[PDB]
């Protein structure tokens, strides 16, 4: 696995700019803030509902531990 | 042209090299307990009456 | 190079001893009053050793097999009723506390409130077994060898 022996490709053109010709910080809060809100919305219904059920079991488990030692 | 006794068990156990893989385990005996003939009978013969289990009947059941 | 160089590297890390006379064949004399358990770190745990009375085997025999789960008593394990040997190991976790604290002569575990014997017997849960005695025999006048 060396660089000129990897795969076969035809009819593809790429254009690039030098790092000394561009800004290292482009649009940061103009593009970046609405981008990290799209990514948060796209994954919130998959990750979060398991950790809500851990919270409800934890509260029921510490409260029914203290309503056993009381009288 | 009768041969000598070097056809040991070559046609019987040693051809298919099944013996050779496990001579650490299977073909491993005859050389610990059969060598009570070895060093301990020789070492106590050079040192007769000098080890502790030679001078032993003098000091029990007194 | 299989049995005389592998299996022969044996005696420093095994039950064979660099303490070849441990303390059990040492001449043990009773510097101990009754009701006093000293923390004897002799093969690990404090071995429960003190005097004995004639009244002693009458209180453990007043509570019979109908209490227990794995029944064995004083005459089963001990040589004669003038001596006692235990280990300080709970059979699930591994501790019973300091002496002179209990109901009438046990060692009440203050972990969450269970109780245990001065002769190795189950009282409360949640441990399954009974306390283990080490193996030895009787030989002598006063030459005790516990092990």
């Amino acid at each position: 696995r060396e660089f000129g022996h990897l795969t076969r490709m035809r009819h593809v053109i790429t254009y690039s700019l030098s790092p000394f010709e561009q800004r290292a910080f482009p649009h940061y809060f103009t593009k970046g803030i609405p981008n990290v809100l799209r990514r948060t919305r796209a994954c919130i219904l998959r990750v979060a509902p398991p950790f809500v059920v851990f919270y409800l079991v934890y509260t029921w488990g510490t409260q029914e531990f203290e309503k056993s030692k009381r009288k | 042209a009768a041969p000598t006794l070097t056809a040991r068990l070559y046609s019987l156990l040693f051809r298919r090299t099944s013996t050779f893989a496990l001579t650490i385990a299977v073909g491993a005996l005859f050389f610990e307990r059969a060598f009570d003939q070895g060093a301990d009978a020789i070492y106590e013969h050079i040192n007769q009456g000098k080890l502790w289990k030679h001078i032993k009947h003098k000091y029990e059941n007194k | 190079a299989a049995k005389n160089a592998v299996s022969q590297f044996v005696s420093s890390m095994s039950a064979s001893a660099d303490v070849l006379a441990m303390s059990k064949i040492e001449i043990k004399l009773s510097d101990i009053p009754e009701g006093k358990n000293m923390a004897f770190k002799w093969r690990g745990k404090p071995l429960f050793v003190r005097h004995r009375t004639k009244k002693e085997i009458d209180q453990e025999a007043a509570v019979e097999v109908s209490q227990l789960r794995d029944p064995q008593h004083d005459l089963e394990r001990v040589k004669k009723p003038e001596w006692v040997i235990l280990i300080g190991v709970c059979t699930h976790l591994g501790c019973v506390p300091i002496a002179n604290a209990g109901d009438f002569g046990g060692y009440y575990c203050p972990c969450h409130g269970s109780h245990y014997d001065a002769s190795g017997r189950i009282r409360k849960g949640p441990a399954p077994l009974n306390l283990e005695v080490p193996t030895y025999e009787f030989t002598s006048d006063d030459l005790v060898i516990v092990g």
């Binding site: 490709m9 056993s68 | - | 890390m13 039950a15 501790c95």
Partner: protein
Amino acid sequence: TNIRKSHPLMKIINNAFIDLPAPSNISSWWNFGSLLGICLILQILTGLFLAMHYTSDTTTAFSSVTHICRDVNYGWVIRYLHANGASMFFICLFIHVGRGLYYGSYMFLETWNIGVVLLFTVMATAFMGYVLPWGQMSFWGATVITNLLSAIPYIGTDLVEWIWGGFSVDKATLTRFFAFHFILPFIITALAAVHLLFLHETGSNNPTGISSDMDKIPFHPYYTIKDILGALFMMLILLILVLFSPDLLGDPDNYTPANPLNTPPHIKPEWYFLFAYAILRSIPNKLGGVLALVASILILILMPMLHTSKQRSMMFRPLSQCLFWMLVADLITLTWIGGQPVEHPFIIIGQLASILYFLIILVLMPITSIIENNLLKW
């Protein structure tokens, strides 16, 4: 005539770190492999110091450790670098395994199987380092291993006596625990070079699960500067836990010395063993509990065989993403239960969560991938 392509030693380094083809869309979750190599080197240049000034016996172990924090110069900083540096190793290891589980990296079969060996070796090492300071948590945590290790029906009673130095708690117990702790970190360093040699045959996986041979970039300078930045952020978190709260990850009862003096108010290990202590404690049989302890780590080897999806990773599988985060929330429950006393609500919870950890991996994950296969018309 290029010297880094023709010198016999330099061309090994060039193929491994400089001219190596790498995918261009590699995320920050691929940073934690070189972080594990930083944490392992750091635990070696800090375990040098502690074993120098050390004596391991039943009479002096608890005081040999208190000598370093007060009397031995620069000993308070190096001791708590070592105790928190092992908590850092275990958080970088659970992120690393969960990455390869999520993106289907276990399809690299030889690399995945050497990894499962590496997870066993660091877990057994750290168990034999917490027994060395000899406090209450060192004693009662070691003496619940041997109850399930003497439960081996034939060889177990002579196995524990051979590793306890010879009888029980004594002087030479901490000469076989200490021997099994000085030398096990160096088998890990040799198992890590073999671990990377198998990955070099295919290169890396990427978050899409599709092969990336048309879009490779060199490793230098793109991921050499990205791995240096991620390592600097790890040293900031580690030195904050050492210089501002060096006892946050720990137990005060292990400052009470070891003796069979009295039963402790509780028994609990460090945080990275609390999921495993919760499983064996919910089995009322010392043979069934030692089998489910080994079956909670060696279950990772069945992950190549249980795969039924036509895709490799979980990026395009929304029903499987829900099950992955149910498994993470199940390991949080077992870490909490394993530091609780054995009472009424923490036995029915701690034993249903032990069941659901095996039900997700074996049954629920292979059926759900088949259901997603039918919905995409293959």
